Automatic annotation (TrEMBL):
Biological source species: Escherichia coli
GO molecular function: acid phosphatase activity; inositol hexakisphosphate 4-phosphatase activity; sugar-phosphatase activity
Pfam families referenced in this protein's UniProt entry, alphabetically: His_Phos_2 (PF00328)
Enzyme Commission identifier(s): 3.1.3.26, 3.1.3.2
Entry similarity comment: Belongs to the histidine acid phosphatase family.
Coiled-coil stretches noted in the UniProt entry, renumbered to this chain: none
GO cellular component annotations of the record: outer membrane-bounded periplasmic space
Stated name of the protein: Acidphosphatase
Amino acid sequence: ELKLESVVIVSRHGVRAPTKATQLMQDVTPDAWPTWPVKLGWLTPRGGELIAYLGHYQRQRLVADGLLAKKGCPQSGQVAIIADVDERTRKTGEAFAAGLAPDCAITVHTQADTSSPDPLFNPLKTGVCQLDNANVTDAILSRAGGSIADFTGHRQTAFRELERVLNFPQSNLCLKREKQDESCSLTQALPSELKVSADNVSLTGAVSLASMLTEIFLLQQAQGMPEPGWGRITDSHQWNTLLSLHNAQFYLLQRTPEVARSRATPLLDLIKTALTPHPPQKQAYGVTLPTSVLFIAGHATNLANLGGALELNWTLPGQPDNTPPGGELVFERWRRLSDNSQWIQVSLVFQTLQQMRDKTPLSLNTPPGEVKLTLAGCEERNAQGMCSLAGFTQIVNEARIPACSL
């Protein structure tokens, strides 16, 4: 019924070491954090291997869909790869190429200067545009339930689960409060406030600490470390409860449209140019678009910003982190043969946490997880839930913030 014509994959980098090692992380647990085999924030060898599995799966699937050849290397830009300048994203691009097309040396393009941020992955970071402070503040606080106190008050069960995993009552932070005849809970020892500036939003205190620590536990598990969370995370309900704090921070800081639309604008522009039929032309990064497959190696924030800007909702069965390492927001252009009309499908492809833990090789018989998505604002849908190319184009043009384009 339909023929696949083009694919654009926006991927988070693979498993990485923690980005920070703070005094506060030391003070909230009596136990020692496991050390990592690479520098802060770098991709681990295992993370690259897990990304290569997704590349191998994508080759098999795209061959089955008739888009790539079964053997040989894709020719003359048929596959293109763009990566953010960070080590973890560049190495993810290389790992994906290695799995998709081994020994084909597909180029991993970055911006010219790899020592400075690339605004494609966040235009706020280079001052291309600025957030509206008042509108962002109100929108985030409303989505929090009206206040950060309301947000944390509804999540006490999850904070107590994190405290149990940390052995928080025996930590230096708690023991000093016990000497001050004070009880000890994460949220009240570390009050959380929303900080909004023209270039960034963040939360302080227990909310941001919890988001980062629960991701670390997930990374330990995906890395194959013997005892993530000191052996105190023993079932899937516990994993899901812990990562709910991480996903909740992303819901506030990265999915809120007042942030997401600006932050995702350059990616929206690149995705739409990649998906729109047009005479092929070399554009950003020296990549000729449109082409058959474009893989973009970015960050969890990019996935969440695109989801919020495009009204794409998901949770990932078997994967506690909604923006997991190697997770892929996959945009596809399909041609309907009955009338040769053009349609856009979006899905979220991901390894389950068990597939990461077991280092499961992926294939058509053992595929990654996949959640089919819908663009909530699409008014022209087909029976398969896809949006017409015209409807997708209208959604993107409404979502994007012109001042944030490159």
